[PDB]
Design a binder for this molecule. Structure first.
Ligand SMILES: NC(=O)C1=CN([C@@H]2O[C@H](COP(=O)(O)OP(=O)(O)OC[C@H]3O[C@@H](n4cnc5c(N)ncnc54)[C@H](O)[C@@H]3O)[C@@H](O)[C@H]2O)C=CC1
Ligand SMILES: Cc1cc2nc3c(=O)[nH]c(=O)nc-3n(C[C@H](O)[C@H](O)[C@H](O)COP(=O)(O)O)c2cc1C
Ligand code: SF4
Ligand code: SF4
Ligand code: SF4
Ligand code: FES
Ligand code: FES
Ligand SMILES: [K+]
Lengths: 430, 44, 230, 213
């Protein structure tokens, strides 16, 4: 196919996304959930991983790793230790609230995804790490898990298969760095949420020292629909190596911010003008677009017109898809203040274990505050770029890269505004 | 019938400050015995 | 024998499996710069001084933690290794106080020596440094946490060797302090050894404080007689 | 915003504190939830339970959690200081948290804040004289498509206007609990100007399953 977008309503995986049906077991089973799951559990982990590999499903957390290879990293014999599948539901990334809607409205899809993923790698039990502030969503998930346990779907002889399974929920304590998989693994174990170094990878040494596979909410909940509908159906959408459907959160200076399921290769402008109502003041009132939240650099209107919102095309556009969160800023926005607020958010949310992030994020916060006040020199700006090059690639986890990227994008795409601001401050105050 | 005009998720207005923990205590009876690490604690 | 062959600067050497990059470079004969790694403590890997570049790999690895593999060529003194070391020194000295002439670690400080022999020679930091309030842990360690770099040798020594488990890191981010969170007197039979494993002048021998200086001292080897360990 | 504890008369290790027997049963369920030999993994939830017994954490729940779980108290101190959910100071009965990250700052959360100061007469991090409300500024809470938004205790109030949050304050002053949902024309996350998708009925089970399942 050449023109993408405009996903059909019958091909949308996440039905009852807006909460227009019942979220309990009766509403879940009347929409197509928990159908022939016993055959899925009986056909074998190799068959399940083959169906995942045929679909071409990639990591929806924000890194875009192939889910088939990562899930096949556990296809090894047991060594006297159990195996665990952990579903990441921290949701600390600004601009992204799709997994909150998935948990609050369709929890049984997530539970069936946990069971299918646990059988797919021989996991003894599943843990779900939810945010501390998501008390009502955690309570809804607990109600759904209790109704699944009481109906014999999971527990002893789960879904009439002979392979037992347990699903747990562990509530967080309000930390963004706990969204990282190794910091999440450490936070489950009662330690502080500080990430580990890889190697050892979590597939070898994870939670409690046992083998552990950490996966996003939507890349887990899609898997029952992958195993039921088929590999070719899920691989038909989008370009090659970018297959599937994605939940896009459009927010910012838009008339109707929302969360919408769409095909992968939908253009940005078409998606905004169709599923969100367009930018206030017209499309020509657009100034900047953040494509996937705080972990990717912004792009201007000159490139946003003809860009494709998948991994490869946005990587070619010197940015990243990330969590697919379209933040929109129009021409009436002080984007220096927006990047300063983003860097201050990173300053307030940083685990501080490894020193380059721990010092350079506060350094960037001070430099951005001086830039907002305009008390800066032009020769400082390139130095700031060099500071980013001392953070990107020298950190334990990827929060340092996610801190260096928005400043690099802001400099690269809006240097004349920064020079104008500092020249204006120098002309006025001196 | 087919209804898509009412917000059906109205249960969350009836949750106290002890809903999650009491639900976990009620759900603990369905769970299997946990695996053992061979010791009481790493500091034991 | 299962000794695999690795390369350091194009020179072959055979190591046992599980040998780190730092251990292989030490076996060849270059001592890789480090701040948090200790050969008698658990590996932490939270200072990034030991970042070296393996060739045909577009990322610098931590030599204190990453195990070697067959055929790995460790470019110990390439361009990006020196760039990473200079960036780490700039970040480390970004918030360090100008306290060398009042310090008791002056002349025997790891930070000063590694800053001269690996780091740059001028500061781009034009902002205000942080100031951490001091604590007390007894009359054996003069405590100045303004100079701490959060290397986390305190917690590993107090948990692994001393085995008292009272030191820790409280806070998140730039406001993290290595303390005890209470007015607790850290007193064990091997307390003063923490003074030996502070690469900066954060922890000072209190009776020795402000009395001497390393370059004017004469070192004489001797045997301890206060116990029967010898 | 301090990470060191001083021995105050209100907050001392000798302050009386204990779990209720129902809280002890919940604590035992949380302990049984985890594998044997790793009871320290129950440090994070059980301490949370202690907050739900008090609303704030003195330094007696830290030592108590160390006593039941047989962990050193400094690990409990590290856990309670690393995370921002634990209130280590006595907060009011209603804990207002306003989000001011970029997707919420773009949709004028500053008007909501200025309404809070102009209504209640306290600054950020300042308490009311009757200890009923405490206003703090927080990061993103995962309600970005419903910006602007605040949270109170465990409830979310999204798509707020200054008049709406003033009315929320007066309704809380009457003692009634408000409705934790978006206050605009939308329900949870749908576009306000009609539904873009999901208007067709769900297709039910067995829709296009692969052969041989
Ligand atoms: N979803 C969210 O809320 C947020 C997402 N992100 C995104 O997260 C990403 C950073 O996270 P990561 O998962 O660490 O990125 P990526 O570098 O690590 O790796 C992707 C996945 O592949 C696995 N992997 C790669 N090579 C492996 C190997 N040889 N053996 C075993 N496993 C291997 C990793 O464990 C990980 O789960 C960024 O792309 C960032 O944009 C960032 C912030 C928030
Ligand atoms: C700082 C940081 C925060 C992250 N936060 C989240 C998160 O909140 N939710 C999530 O699913 N992944 C998050 N990730 C990505 C995870 O490392 C990992 O990609 C995810 O748990 C599973 O990835 P997958 O989609 O390939 O299975 C974060 C990564 C980093 C570096
Ligand atoms: S980059 Fe920052 S958040 Fe990540 S491990 Fe290092 S100090 Fe922690
Ligand atoms: S610890 Fe070292 S670098 Fe720091 S003030 Fe003392 S002598 Fe100077
Ligand atoms: S006081 Fe010294 S030894 Fe202790 S953590 Fe700080 S730098 Fe390391
Ligand atoms: S010595 Fe390896 S990171 Fe510190
Ligand atoms: S930015 Fe405010 S809820 Fe996410
Ligand atoms: K010292």
């Amino acid at each position: 196919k050449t023109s993408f977008g405009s996903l059909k309503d019958e091909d949308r995986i996440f039905t009852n996304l807006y909460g227009r049906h019942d979220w309990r077991l009766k509403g879940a089973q009347s929409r197509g959930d928990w159908y022939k799951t016993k055959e899925i559990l009986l056909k074998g982990p190799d068959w399940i991983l083959g169906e995942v590999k045929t679909s071409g499903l990639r990591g929806r957390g924000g890194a875009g790793f192939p889910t088939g290879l990562k899930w096949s990293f556990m296809n090894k014999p047991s060594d006297g230790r159990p195996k665990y599948l952990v579903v990441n539901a921290d949701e600390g990334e600004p601009g992204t609230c799709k997994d909150r809607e998935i948990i609050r409205h369709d929890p049984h899809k997530l539970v069936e995804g946990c069971l299918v993923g646990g059988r797919a790698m021989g996991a003894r039990a599943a843990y779900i790490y939810i945010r501390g502030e998501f008390y009502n969503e955690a309570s809804n998930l607990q109600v759904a898990i209790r109704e699944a346990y009481e109906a014999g779907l999971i527990g002893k002889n789960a879904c009439g298969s002979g392979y037992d399974f347990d699903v747990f929920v562990v509530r967080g304590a309000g930390a963004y760095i706990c969204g990282e998989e190794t910091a999440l693994i450490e936070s489950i174990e009662g330690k502080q949420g500080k990430p580990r170094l890889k190697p050892p990878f979590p597939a070898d040494v994870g939670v409690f020292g046992c083998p552990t596979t950490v996966a996003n909410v939507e890349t887990v909940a899609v898997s029952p629909t992958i195993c039921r509908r088929g590999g070719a159906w899920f691989a038909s959408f989008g370009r090659e190596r970018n297959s599937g459907t994605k939940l896009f959160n459009i927010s910012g200076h838009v008339n109707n911010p929302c969360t919408v399921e769409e095909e992968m290769s939908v253009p940005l402008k078409e998606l905004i003008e169709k599923h969100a109502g367009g930018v206030t003041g017209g499309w020509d009132n657009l100034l900047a677009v953040i494509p996937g939240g705080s972990s990717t650099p912004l792009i201007p209107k000159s490139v946003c017109e003809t860009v494709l919102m998948d991994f490869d095309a946005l990587i070619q556009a010197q940015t990243g898809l990330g969590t697919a969160a379209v933040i929109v800023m129009d021409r009436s926005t002080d984007i220096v203040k927006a990047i300063a607020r983003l860097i201050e958010f990173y300053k307030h949310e940083s685990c501080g274990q490894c020193t380059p992030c721990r010092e350079g994020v506060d350094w960037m916060n001070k430099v951005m505050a001086r830039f907002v006040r305009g008390d800066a020199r032009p020769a400082e700006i390139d130095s700031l770029w060099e500071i980013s090059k001392q953070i990107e690639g020298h950190t334990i986890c990827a929060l340092g890269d996610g801190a260096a990227w928005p400043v690099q994008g802001l400099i690269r795409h809006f240097r004349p505004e920064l020079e104008e601001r500092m020249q204006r401050f120098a002309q006025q105050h001196q | 019938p087919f209804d898509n005009t009412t917000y059906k998720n109205l249960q969350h207005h009836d949750y106290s400050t002890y809903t999650f923990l009491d639900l976990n205590l009620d759900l603990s009876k369905f769970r299997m015995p946990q695996p053992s690490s061979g010791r009481e604690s790493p500091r034991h | 024998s299962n000794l695999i062959e690795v390369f350091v600067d194009g020179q072959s050497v055979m190591v046992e499996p599980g040998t780190t990059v730092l251990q292989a470079c030490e076996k060849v004969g270059m001592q890789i710069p480090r701040f948090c790694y200790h050969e008698r403590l658990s590996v932490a890997g939270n200072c990034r001084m030991c970042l070296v570049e393996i060739e045909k790999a577009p990322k610098v690895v931590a030599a204190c933690a990453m195990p070697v593999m067959k055929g790995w060529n460790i470019l110990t003194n390439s361009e990006k290794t020196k760039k990473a070391r200079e960036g780490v020194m700039e970040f480390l000295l970004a918030n360090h106080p100008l306290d060398c002439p009042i310090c008791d670690q002056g002349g025997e400080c790891d930070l000063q020596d590694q800053s001269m022999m690996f780091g740059s020679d001028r500061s781009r930091f034009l902002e205000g440094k942080r100031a951490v309030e001091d604590k007390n842990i007894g009359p054996l360690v003069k405590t100045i946490m303004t100079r701490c770099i959060q290397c986390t040798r305190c917690i590993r020594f107090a948990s692994e060797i001393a085995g008292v488990d009272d030191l820790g890191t409280t806070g998140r981010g730039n406001d993290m302090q290595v303390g005890t969170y209470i007015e607790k007197m850290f007193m064990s039979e091997l307390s003063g050894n923490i003074i030996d494993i502070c690469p900066v002048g954060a922890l000072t021998s209190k009776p020795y404080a402000f009395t001497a200086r390393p370059w004017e001292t004469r070192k004489t080897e001797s045997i301890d007689v206060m116990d029967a360990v010898g | 915003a301090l990470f060191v504890h001083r021995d105050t008369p209100k907050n001392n290790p000798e302050t009386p504190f204990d779990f209720t027997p129902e809280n002890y049963k919940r604590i035992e369920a949380i302990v049984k939830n985890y594998p044997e030999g790793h009871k320290a993994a129950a440090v994070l939830p059980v301490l949370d339970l202690a907050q739900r017994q008090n609303g704030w954490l003195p330094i007696s729940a830290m030592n108590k959690v160390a006593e039941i779980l047989q962990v050193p108290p400094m690990r409990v101190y590290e856990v309670a200081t690393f995370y921002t959910m634990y209130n280590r100071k006595p907060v009011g009965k209603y804990h207002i948290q306003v989000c001011t990250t970029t997707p919420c700052m773009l949709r004028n959360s500053d008007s909501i804040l200025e309404a809070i100061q102009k209504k209640l007469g306290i600054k950020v991090g300042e308490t009311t004289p009757d200890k009923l409300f405490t206003l703090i500024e927080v990061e993103c809470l995962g309600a970005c498509v419903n910006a602007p938004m605040v949270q109170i205790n465990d409830n979310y109030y999204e798509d707020l206007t200054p008049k709406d949050i003033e009315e929320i304050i007066d309704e809380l002053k009457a003692g009634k609990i408000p409705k934790p949902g978006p206050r605009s024309g939308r329900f949870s996350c749908e576009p306000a100007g009609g539904l873009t998708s999901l208007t067709e009925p769900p297709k039910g089970p067995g829709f296009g399953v692969q052969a041989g399942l």
